[PDB]
Structure formats: C-alpha cells, structure tokens
Design a protein around this ligand. Structure first.
Ligand code: TUW
Length: 92
C-alpha cells in the first residue's frame, strides 16, 4: 500500500472528460470511489493497449485523451501518489 485506504475509499466526481473516459469502458454513474476510478482507468489502458512489453510498468498515453487529461506522454504504474495527483487534477 502506497495510498491510505481511507483516501482510496473516498467518493469523487469526475470532471466531464474523465467521465467520458470512464463511460467509454462501461462505467454508468457520475460519482465513484477513487479505487473505482482507478479500476476503470486500468480497463481503459488495457483496452487501448497503452502499454509495451519492453517497459512493462509504463503506461504510454501520448496522442490519447488519457495523456491530455494527465498532462504527460507516459507514466509509471508504480508511482501511486503521482497517479492520484494526476486524477485529482481531473475531479470536480
Ligand atoms: C501493463 C501495465 C502498464 O503494467 C499496467 C496497466 C494497467 F492498466 C494497470 C496496471 C499495470 C496496474 O497495476 N493497474 C492497477 C493500479 C495501478 C496503480 C494504481 C494507483 N495509484 C492503481 N491501480 C492498472 O489497472 C489494472 C486493471 C484494473 O485494476 C486490470 C485493468 C492501472 C489502473 C489505473 C492506472 Cl491510472 C494505471 C494502471
């Protein structure tokens, strides 16, 4: 665990383009726990194949709405506080 359980559990409201992303992989609500947002972001990453076998912990999100939302061309799945901060930029 890198992120406290209580923080993972908290209900959040995605801004519209993050909601678009979540809805494109089957999410059907306006509010989610951060853990739920992360689950659907993972579904999106795996669906769009934003990964590479040579660097298995890197999400390659350039030229993708996810990259626009997070403001980076790539990031490491191991850096959870950095991921949370990128999500917070996208919550109401
Ligand atoms: C192959 C690759 C690049 O290594 C990869 C891709 C991937 F999509 C996931 C992982 C790894 C991984 O470990 N995940 C779980 C995770 C990672 C970090 C945090 C935080 N803070 C929370 N959860 C991901 O989702 C996994 C899954 C849903 O749980 C089945 C679809 C995931 C979710 C969301 C984000 Cl933003 C980033 C990553």
């Amino acid at each position: 665990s890198q992120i406290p359980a209580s923080e993972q559990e908290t209900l959040v409201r995605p801004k519209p383009l993050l909601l678009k992303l979540l809805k494109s992989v089957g999410a059907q609500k306006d509010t989610y726990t951060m853990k739920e947002v992360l689950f659907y972001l993972g579904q999106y990453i795996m669906t769009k194949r934003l990964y590479d076998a040579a660097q298995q912990h890197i999400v390659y999100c350039s030229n993708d709405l996810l990259g626009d939302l997070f403001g980076v061309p790539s990031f490491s799945v191991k850096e959870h506080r950095k991921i949370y901060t990128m999500i917070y930029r996208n919550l109401v």
